Amino acid sequence: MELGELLYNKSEYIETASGNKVSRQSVLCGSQNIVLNGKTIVMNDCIIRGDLANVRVGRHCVVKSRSVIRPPFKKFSKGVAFFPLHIGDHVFIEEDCVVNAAQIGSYVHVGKNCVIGRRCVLKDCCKILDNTVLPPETVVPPFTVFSGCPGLFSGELPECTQELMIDVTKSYYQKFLPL
Amino acid sequence: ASLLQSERVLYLVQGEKKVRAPLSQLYFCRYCSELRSLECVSHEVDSHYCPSCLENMPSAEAKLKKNRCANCFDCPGCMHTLSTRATAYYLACGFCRWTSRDVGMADKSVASGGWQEPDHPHTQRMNKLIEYYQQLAQ
Amino acid sequence: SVKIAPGAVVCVESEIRGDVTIGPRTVIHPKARIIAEAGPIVIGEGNLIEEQALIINAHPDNITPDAEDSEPKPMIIGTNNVFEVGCYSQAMKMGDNNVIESKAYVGRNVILTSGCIIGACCNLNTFEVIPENTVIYGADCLRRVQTERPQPQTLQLDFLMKILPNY
Amino acid sequence: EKTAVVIDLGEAFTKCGFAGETGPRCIIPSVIKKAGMPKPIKVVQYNINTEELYSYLKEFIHILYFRHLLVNPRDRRVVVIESVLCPSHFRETLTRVLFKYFEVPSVLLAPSHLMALLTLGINSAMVLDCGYRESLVLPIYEGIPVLNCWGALPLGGKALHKELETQLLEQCTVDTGAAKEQSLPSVMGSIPEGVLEDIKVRTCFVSDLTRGLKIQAAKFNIDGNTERPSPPPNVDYPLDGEKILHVLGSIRDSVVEILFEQDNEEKSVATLILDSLMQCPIDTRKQLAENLVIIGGTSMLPGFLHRLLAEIRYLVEKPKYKKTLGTKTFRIHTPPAKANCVAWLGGAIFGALQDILGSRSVSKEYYNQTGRIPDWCSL
Numbered sequence: 001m002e003l004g005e006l007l008y009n010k011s012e013y014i015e016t017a018s019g020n021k022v023s024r025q026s027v028l029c030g031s032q033n034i035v036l037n038g039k040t041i042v043m044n045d046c047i048i049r050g051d052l053a054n055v056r057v058g059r060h061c062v063v064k065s066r067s068v069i070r071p072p073f074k075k076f077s078k079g080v081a082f083f084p085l086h087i088g089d090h091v092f093i094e095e096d097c098v099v100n101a102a103q104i105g106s107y108v109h110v111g112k113n114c115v116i117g118r119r120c121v122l123k124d125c126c127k128i129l130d131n132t133v134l135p136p137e138t139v140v141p142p143f144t145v146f147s148g149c150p151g152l153f154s155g156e157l158p159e160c161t162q163e164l165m166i167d168v169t170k171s172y173y174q175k176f177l178p179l
Numbered sequence: 180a181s182l183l184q185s186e187r188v189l190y191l192v193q194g195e196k197k198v199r200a201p202l203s204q205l206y207f208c209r210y211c212s213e214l215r216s217l218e219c220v221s222h223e224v225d226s227h228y229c230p231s232c233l234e235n236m237p238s239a240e241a242k243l244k245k246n247r248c249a250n251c252f253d254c255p256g257c258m259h260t261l262s263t264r265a266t267a268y269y270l271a272c273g274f275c276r277w278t279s280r281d282v283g284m285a286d287k288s289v290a291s292g293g294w295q296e297p298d299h300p301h302t303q304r305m306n307k308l309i310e311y312y313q314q315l316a317q
Numbered sequence: 318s319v320k321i322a323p324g325a326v327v328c329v330e331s332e333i334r335g336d337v338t339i340g341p342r343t344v345i346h347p348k349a350r351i352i353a354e355a356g357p358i359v360i361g362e363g364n365l366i367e368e369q370a371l372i373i374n375a376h377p378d379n380i381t382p383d384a385e386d387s388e389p390k391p392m393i394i395g396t397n398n399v400f401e402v403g404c405y406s407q408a409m410k411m412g413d414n415n416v417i418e419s420k421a422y423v424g425r426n427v428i429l430t431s432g433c434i435i436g437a438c439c440n441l442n443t444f445e446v447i448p449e450n451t452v453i454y455g456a457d458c459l460r461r462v463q464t465e466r467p468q469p470q471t472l473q474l475d476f477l478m479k480i481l482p483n484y
Numbered sequence: 485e486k487t488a489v490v491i492d493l494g495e496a497f498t499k500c501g502f503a504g505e506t507g508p509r510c511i512i513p514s515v516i517k518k519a520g521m522p523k524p525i526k527v528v529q530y531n532i533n534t535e536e537l538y539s540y541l542k543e544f545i546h547i548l549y550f551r552h553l554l555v556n557p558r559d560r561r562v563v564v565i566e567s568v569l570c571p572s573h574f575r576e577t578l579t580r581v582l583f584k585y586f587e588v589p590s591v592l593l594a595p596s597h598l599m600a601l602l603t604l605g606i607n608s609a610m611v612l613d614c615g616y617r618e619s620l621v622l623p624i625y626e627g628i629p630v631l632n633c634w635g636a637l638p639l640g641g642k643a644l645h646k647e648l649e650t651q652l653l654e655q656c657t658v659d660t661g662a663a664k665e666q667s668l669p670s671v672m673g674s675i676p677e678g679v680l681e682d683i684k685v686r687t688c689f690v691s692d693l694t695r696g697l698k699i700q701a702a703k704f705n706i707d708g709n710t711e712r713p714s715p716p717p718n719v720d721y722p723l724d725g726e727k728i729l730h731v732l733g734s735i736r737d738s739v740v741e742i743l744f745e746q747d748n749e750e751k752s753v754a755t756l757i758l759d760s761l762m763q764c765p766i767d768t769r770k771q772l773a774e775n776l777v778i779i780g781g782t783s784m785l786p787g788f789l790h791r792l793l794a795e796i797r798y799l800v801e802k803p804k805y806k807k808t809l810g811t812k813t814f815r816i817h818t819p820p821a822k823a824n825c826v827a828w829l830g831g832a833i834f835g836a837l838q839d840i841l842g843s844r845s846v847s848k849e850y851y852n853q854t855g856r857i858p859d860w861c862s863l
C-alpha cells in the first residue's frame with residue numbers, strides 16, 4: 001500500500017529454525033527430499049510434496065496460503081520419473097497459486113491463483129500476473145510479463161527488478177513477526 | 180514494483196514534455212543533471228532472441244529469416260510455443276490439443292530440418308513487377 | 318462404511334468420508350477430498366486423484382428438493398482418469414479415458430466420454446453431455462476442438478506403485 | 485540504403501512490414517492497452533485534441549517498430565499509406581510524431597487507391613475501397629487520381645457491425661446456463677465490437693442478387709404474404725464461455741443487405757462505382773469500366789465480388805445509367821495479394837524503388853525548416 005509493506009502478525013504455532021519459518025497448518029509430505037537453505041516463509045495450508053523431488057528454495061523465499069509446489073513427471077521413453085524442481089533466490093509465490101514447474105528462476109513474482117504447467121522453465125527477473133495459465137513446457141524470458149488463459153507475452157517489466165525485488169521479500173520477512 | 184503499489188507516488192521530468200512516472204520506471208542521466216522518463220528517452224535495437232529456445236541471433240540473419248526462429252513454432256489455433264512429439268515426429272500444443280496431423284502435414288524423418296512453410300503463391304509475379312518499376316523509376 | 322480393494326495404492330493420510338466404494342488400481346494423492354454424502358463414490362481401476370480434488374455426492378445439499386423418492390445418484394467414475402491439481406468435480410456418471418486439467422470446475426450434471434479434456438482454470442456449471450473425443454481450452458471462452466485420437470495415461474499411474482511406499 | 489518500412493494506419497486494422505516483400509509481416513487491431521482502461525482505446529480517432537491523439541500514435545508506432553517489427557526507426561525511411569481525404573490534423577499529427585519523436589529520415593504520404601493500382605501493373609483502373617468507416621471510390625487514370633469524380637458512403641465495417649448488433653437484439657435467443665435453455669432476450673444491454681466482428685466473419689455471408697432482391701421486398705412486406713426465400717440453418721455462438729447465443733438464419737443473409745439496399749436515394753456500394761464513372765471524362769469511360777479493382781476487408785466477405793458485379797449490371801439497365809453506361813463491359817481485376825493487403829503491397833512495391841522514393845518523399849530537414857506537409861489542398 002503506497003510503496004510501504006504492511007504488518008502481518010503470525011500465531012504461536014510455526015516451525016522457526018535457522019531463520020526458516022514454516023506454518024504447522026501447511027503439510028509438506030516428504031520432509032527428507034525437500035530442502036530450505038535460507039530464511040524462507042511457507043504460509044498455512046500450503047503443499048510441498050516429496051514425490052521423488054529435490055525442492056531447493058531461495059535465501060528469502062515466500063509462499064502465501066493455499067498454494068502448492070509439486071514437481072512434474074518427465075514422459076521419457078527410457079524411464080518415466082518426477083523431475084526435481086529448483087526454486088531460485090528471492091522467489092515470491094502468491095496466494096492460492098498452483099506450481100507444476102521445473103527450474104523456477106531467482107527474483108520472480110508469481111501471481112495469485114495462477115496455474116503454471118508441467119515441465120515449465122522460468123528464467124530470472126520475470127512476473128506472472130494473477131488468474132493466468134502457463135501451459136506445459138513453456139519458457140518466459142527475463143524482464144517479461146506473461147498473462148491470459150493462453151499464457152503469452154503481455155509486455156516488459158521495470159528495468160530495476162534485481163535491486164527492487166530484494167527490498168520486497170526482505171521487508172515482508174522482517175515485517176512478518178509473531179503477535 | 181506491482182505487489183507494493185509503485186504506481187502511486189510519482190516523480191516529475193524537466194524538458195519540453197512533463198510526465199508523472201514512478202521512480203522504478205524512470206532513469207537518471209549522469210552526463211548532465213536531469214532525470215528523464217522511458218517516454219522522453221530515444222529507444223534503440225541491440226539483439227534479437229527467441230522466447231522458447233533462447234538463442235541470440237544476429238541482425239543480418241533476422242532480415243533473411245523475417246524476424247523468426249527456424250527450430251521453434253507457435254500454434255495457430257491458440258498463441259503458444261509448440262512441442263515436437265514422436266510415435267517419426269508430429270507438432271502438438273499443451274494448452275489446446277491441436278496437432279500438425281489435424282491440418283494434414285506429413286510427419287518428417289529428421290526432427291527440425293524437415294519442417295517448412297510453403298512458398299508465397301504470388302512471389303514470381305512480385306519480382307517481375309519490381310524489376311519493371313525499377314527500370315521505369317531509373 | 319469403506320470397501321478398500323487390494324492393488325489400489327490409496328494413501329491413508331488423504332481424507333475420506335461416507336459410504337465409499339474404492340476401485341481395483343486407483344492411486345489417491347494426499348489432501349484429496351472425497352465425500353459420499355447421499356450416494357456412494359464408485360471408482361474405476363486407474364482413476365488416480367492428484368492434490369485438491371473436491372469429489373462430493375451432495376445433490377441433497379446442492380438443490381434439496383425432497384423429490385425423486387430415494388434419489389441415491391450414485392457417483393460412477395470410469396477407468397484411466399487423471400484428476401489434476403485443484404479441479405472441482407460432481408458428475409453422477411463419468412466415462413473412461415478422460416483428463417480434467419488443474420483448477421477445472423466440472424458442473425453438477427456433466428457426463429464425460431473418452432479422449433475428452435476440460436481446460437485449465439476453466440469453469441463449466443451448465444449441464445451438457447460432452448461429445449466423443451473433444452477437448453475444451455480457456456476460461457474466457459470454451460472454444461471446443463475435436464481431438465484426432467484419445468490420450469492414454471497408464472505409464473504415469475504404474476510408476477507411482479514404486480514412489481508411494483515410505484511416504 | 486536500407487529496405488524502407490511500410491505502415492497503413494486504419495480504424496479496424498493496421499498493415500505493417502518491409503518493402504519488396506510478398507505481403508505484410510504484421511497485421512493487428514489498431515488499439516493500445518493503457519493501464520486503468522478495461523477496453524483498449526482506438527489509436528486513430530478523428531475530431532479530438534492534438535495532444536491526446538499525439539500520445540496514442542506515439543504509443544502505437546512504438547509497439548509497431550519494436551514488438552511487431554524489430555528495427556531502429558531513425559536508420560531507415562517510412563512509406564505511410566493513408567486514404568485520400570484523410571482528416572488534415574490527423575495526417576499532420578502522424579507526420580509530426582514520426583519526424584519529432586522517432587526522428588525518421590523521410591515519410592511518403594501515398595494515397596491507398598494509387599498504390600492498389602501498382603500491384604496489378606495496369607496504369608489506369610477504377611478503385612473501390614470498402615473499409616471500416618466509409619466505402620470510398622476514386623478513378624485513377626494513367627497515374628493521375630481524379631479527385632473531381634470522387635465518391636463515398638458510410639456502408640463499411642462500422643455500419644455493418646451496428647446493423648448486426650440491432651438485428652441480434654430484436655431476435656435475441658441466448659442460453660446463459662441458469663435455467664436459460666428457454667429463449668432469453670437482451671440479458672446483456674450491448675454486445676462488444678470484438679464479438680460482433682467474429683460473428684460477421686464466420687456466420688454471415690453475402691447472398692446472390694436474385695435471392696437478395698427477394699430478401700429486400702420480404703422484410704419490407706410490401707402488400708405480400710410471406711414472400712421470403714428459405715434461410716440457412718441457425719448457428720449457435722458462445723458468448724463469454726457459459727452463455728450460448730443462437731444466431732437466426734435470417735440475420736446472416738439480411739445484415740449484409742444494408743450495403744446493397746437502394747433506400748430511395750439510389751445510394752448503395754454498387755451504385756457508387758456507376759455514380760462516379762458517369763461523372764468521369766467521356767474519353768476515360770471505357771478504359772476505367774474494363775479495369776475495376778475491389779480492395780478493403782469488407783469485400784473479403786464470402787460472395788461479395790459476385791453480388792457487386794451482378795448488382796452493377798442490374799443498375800446499368802436502370803433508366804438513369806442506361807443512356808451513358810448502357811453498352812459497357814465491366815470486368816474485375818484479381819490482385820496478387822488478398823483484398824485486405826492490396827493497399828500495403830503497393831507501398832512495398834513503391835518502397836523497393838529507392839531512387840524515386842528519396843526524391844518524392846518529404847525529408848526531416850525540410851519539415852524541421854518549413855513545418856508544412858504537402859497536401860492536395862492549396863499551399
Ligand SMILES: Nc1ncnc2c1ncn2[C@@H]1O[C@H](COP(=O)(O)OP(=O)(O)O)[C@@H](O)[C@H]1O
Nearest residue numbers: 494495496497615616641685780781782784785
Ligand atoms: N479476412 C477478412 N475476412 C472478412 N472480413 C474481414 C477480413 N479482414 C477484415 N475484415 C472486415 O473488414 C474490415 C476491413 O477494414 P480495414 O480495411 O482493415 O480498415 P481501414 O479501412 O481502416 O483501413 C474490418 O473492420 C473487418 O470487419
Ligand SMILES: [Zn+2]
Nearest residue numbers: 229232248251
Ligand atoms: Zn526458438
Ligand SMILES: [Zn+2]
Nearest residue numbers: 254257272275
Ligand atoms: Zn494451440
